[PDB]
């Protein structure tokens, strides 16, 4: 946009299924490396998990005391259950709609994860709720932890370029979150 | 020999859901079927079980469990009705401590990936011991129905084929202690919702080896005992003769 | 003519637990026979008497009790004897009986020493009545009801917890249940210091069960706790 | 004998709160169901203690936590008072159904069709009124008075010998038909207002379905559900 | 034989006028209760001739003389027709409860839970309606017709052998638990309108609870209450 | 014995939805009927499983596909649940009629006149009110309560020995009276609101007629209807 974003946001939507059962420590190290890096207090971030209940594990807050308390919760999340990636997106879309009632032009960044991909009808609602999140004014980045399908996460994100493998993920998203930060206020 | 629910689990009438003569026998009925099972180490946590589905093991050959001419009789008959007889050995020495729980669980789906269809043989070698997570305690991993795009998919929070891991001693069981025995002897009869179930798709029993006390041994002493088992069907009644299953 | 009937004050009332039948709608059905199934549960006291594992805080709880080599004048484990206590939630005593209202009988803790074979020692098993303060000292454990369990031929001891109560039945979901506190205390004490042989692991584990006695009886079914499903 | 299996499950309890039909129904199409299928959802009560979804037998039980707008919500039923006291595998009993209205002064009527049969889904034009084909049939369509309660005892009709409380086989072929019994039900009921389809109202009237298991028989001792420690 | 104890207390009389539930209740928290506790007050009738306060057994009886605004008033019940003819100490009898509506054409329903058990206080979402967990259970939830009366006879369920009309001990430890028996009750009832919580109305509907003591047995001759001389 | 003929047809099923009389009727004139005949159509239920038209026995069964405006539509009834299981030619049974109202809180009344008799169609002026001649008679005029159901069992009254399910002769002479039995009926019923003709309302109230064949006897094995292959 022409005007800079008065508030900047960041949504960590993390899979905690039985398919990430051996790779949660790789996911939590990816979240902490994006949380303890961006120490700027203008960033309001949120921690969303999904296995069966799409749960907001940390609300949309900015202060680094609650975020460090939130990362104490993510370190003890035992993986287990199904993969409802459409309910990880409803927790984002019930926060974008709650924060579009102010007047600012903000920016919401979505980070989604999966090792074992979804069933045929679980993918359909996740495609619908990602469209629900895109229509509310967000940008979706489907970060890929180990072996997945590049085509399947391309329907969730904006395009196939927004999907990154997690070993390239912090290589990518170090400057992609920073891409808006060199355009923001 | 821990007989189950009767004095003699060999006693079994022919099924009342057939009009033909049952194939009561086959070419080697007084022999056992020995298969490997994954070794028990120190890193195995408490309640990390390992399920051997019967007769799901004769088909997938879980641990080299070759069924000989019982699998080749099960594939050539539609309805099958037998009572099992397992025998798990594990060479517990004086130098080990710990206690397995060998049970014969009725009607559970413990070989099923809490996230899909049925387990392969490579994936039984990768994990080696199925950890008792929140899914296996709440039954949240028996396979969910494909509802379709119309119905909104509900949050599946429970399923009746759980394991309550603290209650597995209600089943026909013997505890493979470090200082009472080295092998168990369980003999179970036929059960089922019908007088005889199918052959390719029945799971009426399940051999279940659960670690109650984790293995501890001194370094340099006897290390990592192997677990074998020996399944043997007692009085089968094969109905519905047809050709080999496709 | 017509029989003159005066209908009562509870007419047209569907009561849930009315001990009587109703009109058959689709009668004359010959059900398929169930003679082939073995093990018919006639009575659910056939499963309170089956010894099932207990739980211990050290949602990852532990059925056994670790035995540290430090000899000490305090109990190795001491849990209260209450069927609402969370060392009984996943037994078959405390899970069947929690869905009822009253019980009467003898809880039967079956022990199992899962240590090495050449271990030698004694254990003291003191059940206490409900006192104002929990007994801790082994001297406070000898004065209660005790039984000395040796690691000899007995690698499995079934300590029958007595039934001592001022009422014929006990409230089965209640912390207090009685005069001031906590309904009793089983306590496995170690009596002599345990000789574990070298090149055999130190810190053995004792595995606890919880069955019910032969005189265990239950009463008054209540609507259960449906919070297993969330 | 309050732990008696024939005594314990012989009492009325809630199963499902189903909506009352006001036209000729379309029975819910089997799984998977694609979008755009015009049908009638949640009007049918599959009479089974096992978990259901969309009036069909389900593997797991699933409720809704945040029921947002996209998609059609599904009537999932479960017998909460059963599984907490169902420490067994098989359970044959004769069902006693009671259908209590949840609408002030409702005249409803309760259909039924056995285990394995299907709903008759059309309408015949009697006197230029669409009278549906669930007013007639050889199965019990009990009629309620204005403000009354429908009650009848149903037999064990299914082709299975017993109902598996826990089942591990596969009804159809494998890959997500594990642990899904096909013929474990006493049938299905549904409520309908006994007026033709041109008198279809606008309100959505609910009704509640109770269940009593007459002559309960249970086999093969098994577990009870896991109680958490939080 | 009109002075016969089995004949004299064998007649119906008023106990309490309790309010009818219209949602999933919160049972009154035990004493002392601090301010700001969100709960549901006076909806429960503790079935006992002894004095009660906030649906829990009380030591004394206390009414209100000038009920001003500050604080929550407490439903205190007493059996006035009992103690004036209770010249004895202990009293075991089987209770007969009759619940008469004090609202014109009310459809209510009467729950119950035994002596020592507790109310099940939550709700399950059936068909996007909050149906509470007091519609189901193993305890009698009798349902009334529209304008009818609920009546049933309850047994002596408590774990005490008899009900102390006069009691001098201490249930818990001392310092204001003297003369307060804990297990002297036939249970507790409560009325609920059998509609889900989204159909909660605005009016506060009352109901009245009667009591008949079937098969009265009295022991240990004692005093009668003091009549004044004014 | 669920295939027993005495058991299979011994259950209630719908026959016709007839309109309720509110004046002295004119019975439908026999076929052919020219235009301009003032009469009362569809108010009479000819109690027969065979097809009817205009409350008279018909050869074929005929419904309407595109019921346009010109002409008077005719109440054609058939017992759908009969002929699909009527693999026989003759059928004598005693009829059990149940008349269920399809109007909220209707007070109706059910006349009857036997096989071969006719409706009495006039009115006598009682107290300056036209009371019709179907309030009186030697035949059963059962009266319903306000919101009730009329039920009675009718005998095999007809002069035929049995009812031909299939008939091939000619009742009158030939040329379109082939296959049309004249005396195959248990009679005819009709509903009337028991108020005189000056209190005739404006709405057109319907009512539904059920049928149970008590003591069914079937002779001469014959075919079942042809099921299509589309
Ligand atoms: Mg997964």
Swiss-Prot record, chain A:
Glycans are attached at residues 131, 149. GO terms for molecular function: actin filament binding; collagen binding; metal ion binding; transmembrane signaling receptor activity. Disulfide bonds join 4-185. Keywords: Cell membrane, Cell projection, Disulfide bond, Glycoprotein, Hypotrichosis, Membrane, Metal-binding, Phosphoprotein, Receptor, Signal, Transmembrane, Transmembrane helix. Glycosylated. Glycosylation is essential for Seneca Valley virus (SVV) attachment and entry. The keyword 4Fe-4S does not apply. Residues 3-185 are extracellular. GO terms for cellular component: cell surface; endosome membrane; external side of plasma membrane; filopodium membrane; lamellipodium membrane; plasma membrane. A divalent metal cation binds at residues 17, 19, 83. One of its GO terms (biological process) is negative regulation of extracellular matrix assembly. Residues 119-125 are annotated as: Interaction with PA. It comes from the Eukaryota. It is found in: Cell membrane; Cell projection, Lamellipodium membrane; Cell projection, Filopodium membrane. Detected in umbilical vein endothelial cells (at protein level). Highly expressed in tumor endothelial cells. Residues 9-180 form the VWFA domain. Induction: Up-regulated in cultured angiogenic umbilical vein endothelial cells. Belongs to the ATR family. Interacts with gelatin and type 1 collagen. Interacts with the actin cytoskeleton. Plays a role in cell attachment and migration. Interacts with extracellular matrix proteins and with the actin cytoskeleton and thereby plays an important role in normal extracellular matrix (ECM) homeostasis. Mediates adhesion of cells to type 1 collagen and gelatin, reorganization of the actin cytoskeleton and promotes cell spreading. Plays a role in the angiogenic response of cultured umbilical vein endothelial cells. May also act as a receptor for PLAU. Upon ligand binding, stimulates the phosphorylation of EGFR and ERK1/2. (Microbial infection) Acts as a receptor for protective antigen (PA) of B.anthracis. It is linked to Hemangioma, capillary infantile: A condition characterized by dull red, firm, dome-shaped hemangiomas, sharply demarcated from surrounding skin, usually presenting at birth or occurring within the first two or three months of life. They result from highly proliferative, localized growth of capillary endothelium and generally undergo regression and involution without scarring. This is Anthrax toxin receptor 1. It comes from Homo sapiens (Human). The chain holds residues 38 to 220 of 564 of the full protein.
């Amino acid at each position: 946009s022409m005007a800079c974003y008065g508030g900047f946001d960041l949504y960590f939507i993390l899979d905690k299924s039985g398919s990430v059962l051996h790779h949660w420590n790789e996911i939590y190290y990816f979240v902490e490396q994006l949380a303890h890096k961006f120490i700027s207090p203008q960033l309001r971030m949120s921690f969303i998990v999904f296995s069966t209940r799409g749960t907001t594990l940390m609300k949309l807050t900015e202060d680094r005391e609650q975020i460090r308390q939130g990362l104490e919760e993510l370190q003890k999340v035992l993986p287990g259950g199904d993969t409802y990636m459409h309910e990880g997106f409803e927790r984002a879309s019930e926060q974008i709609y709650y924060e579009n009632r102010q007047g600012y032009r903000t920016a919401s960044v979505i980070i989604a994860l999966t090792d074992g991909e979804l069933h045929e009808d679980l993918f359909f609602y996740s495609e619908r709720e990602a469209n629900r999140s895109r229509d509310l004014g967000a940008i979706v980045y489907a970060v890929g932890v180990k072996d997945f399908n590049e085509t399947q996460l391309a329907r969730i994100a904006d395009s196939k370029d927004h999907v990154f493998p997690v070993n390239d993920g912090f290589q990518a998203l170090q400057g992609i979150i920073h891409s808006i930060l060199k355009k923001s206020c | 020999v821990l007989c189950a629910y009767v004095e003699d689990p060999t006693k079994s009438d022919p099924p009342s859901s057939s009009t033909d003569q049952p194939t009561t026998t086959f070419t080697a009925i007084d022999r056992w079927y020995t298969g490997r099972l994954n070794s028990w180490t120190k890193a195995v946590k408490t309640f990390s079980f390992q399920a051997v589905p019967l007769p799901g093991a004769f088909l997938s050959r879980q641990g080299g469990l070759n069924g000989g001419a019982f699998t080749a009789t099960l594939h050539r008959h539609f309805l099958m009705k037998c009572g099992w007889q397992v025998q798990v050995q594990c060479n517990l020495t004086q130098f080990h401590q710990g206690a397995l729980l060998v049970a014969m669980v009725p009607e559970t789906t413990l070989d099923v990936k809490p996230d899909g269809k049925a387990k392969s043989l490579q994936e039984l070698n990768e994990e080696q011991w199925v950890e008792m997570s929140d899914d296996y305690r709440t039954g949240k991993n028996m396979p969910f129905q494909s509802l379709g795009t119309y119905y909104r998919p509900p949050n599946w929070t429970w399923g009746p084929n759980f394991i309550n891991p603290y209650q597995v001693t209600v089943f026909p069981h013997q505890i493979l202690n470090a200082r009472t025995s080295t092998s168990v002897d369980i003999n179970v009869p036929y059960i089922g919702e019908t007088p005889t179930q199918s052959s390719e798709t029945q799971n009426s029993w399940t051999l279940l080896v659960m670690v109650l006390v984790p293995l501890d041994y001194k370094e340099g002493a006897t290390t990592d005992p192997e677990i074998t088992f020996s399944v043997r069907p007692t009085s089968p009644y094969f109905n519905g003769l047809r050709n080999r299953y496709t | 003519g017509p029989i003159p009937t005066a209908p009562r004050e509870n007419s047209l009332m569907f009561l849930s637990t009315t001990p009587d039948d109703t009109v058959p709608a689709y009668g004359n059905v010959r059900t398929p026979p169930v003679n082939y199934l073995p093990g018919e549960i006639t009575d659910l006291l056939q499963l309170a008497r089956i010894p099932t594992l207990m739980a211990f805080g050290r949602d990852a709880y532990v059925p056994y009790v670790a035995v540290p080599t430090q000899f000490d004048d305090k109990p190795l484990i001491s849990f209260p004897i209450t069927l609402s206590d969370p060392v009984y939630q996943n037994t078959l005593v405390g899970a069947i009986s929690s869905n009822f209202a009253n019980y009467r009988g003898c809880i039967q803790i079956t022990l199992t020493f899962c240590g090495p074979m050449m271990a030698r020692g004694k254990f003291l098993l003191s059940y206490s009545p409900p006192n104002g303060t929990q007994p801790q000292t082994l001297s406070e454990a000898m004065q209660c009801t005790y039984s000395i369990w040796d690691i000899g031929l007995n690698s499995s001891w079934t300590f029958v917890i007595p039934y001592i109560s001022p009422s014929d039945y006990r409230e089965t979901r209640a912390i207090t249940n009685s005069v001031y506190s906590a309904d009793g205390w089983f306590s496995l004490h170690k009596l002599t210091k345990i000789t574990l042989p070298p090149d055999c692991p130190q810190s053995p584990c004792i595995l606890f069960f919880a069955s019910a006695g032969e005189d265990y009886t239950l009463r008054l079914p209540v609507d259960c706790n449906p919070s297993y499903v969330f | 004998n309050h732990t008696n299996v024939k005594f314990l499950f012989d009492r009325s309890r809630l199963l499902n709160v189903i909506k009352v039909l006001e036209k000729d129904a379309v029975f819910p199409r089997p799984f998977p169901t694609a979008t755009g299928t015009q049908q009638d959802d949640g009007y049918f009560c599959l009479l089974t203690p096992r978990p259901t979804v969309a009036s069909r037998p389900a593997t797991r039980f699933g409720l809704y936590v945040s029921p947002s707008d996209s998609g059609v919500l599904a009537n999932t039923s479960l017998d909460f008072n059963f599984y907490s006291l169902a420490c067994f595998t098989y359970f044959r009993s004769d069902l006693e159904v009671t259908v209590v209205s949840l609408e002030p002064d409702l005249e409803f009527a309760v259909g039924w069709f056995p285990s394995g049969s299907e709903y008759q889904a059309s309408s015949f034009v009697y006197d230029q009124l669409h009278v549906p084909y669930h007013f007639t049939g050889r199965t019990p369509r009990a009629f309620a008075s204005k403000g009354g309660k429908v009650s009848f005892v149903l037999p064990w009709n299914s082709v299975s010998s017993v109902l598996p409380v826990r089942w591990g086989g596969a009804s159809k072929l494998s890959s997500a038909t594990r642990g899904l019994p096909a013929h474990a039900d006493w049938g299905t009921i549904y409520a309908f207002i006994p007026r033709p389809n041109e008198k279809k109202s606008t309100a959505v009237k609910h009704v509640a379905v109770y269940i009593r298991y007459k002559n309960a028989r249970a086999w093969c001792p098994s577990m009870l559900p896991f109680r958490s420690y939080k």
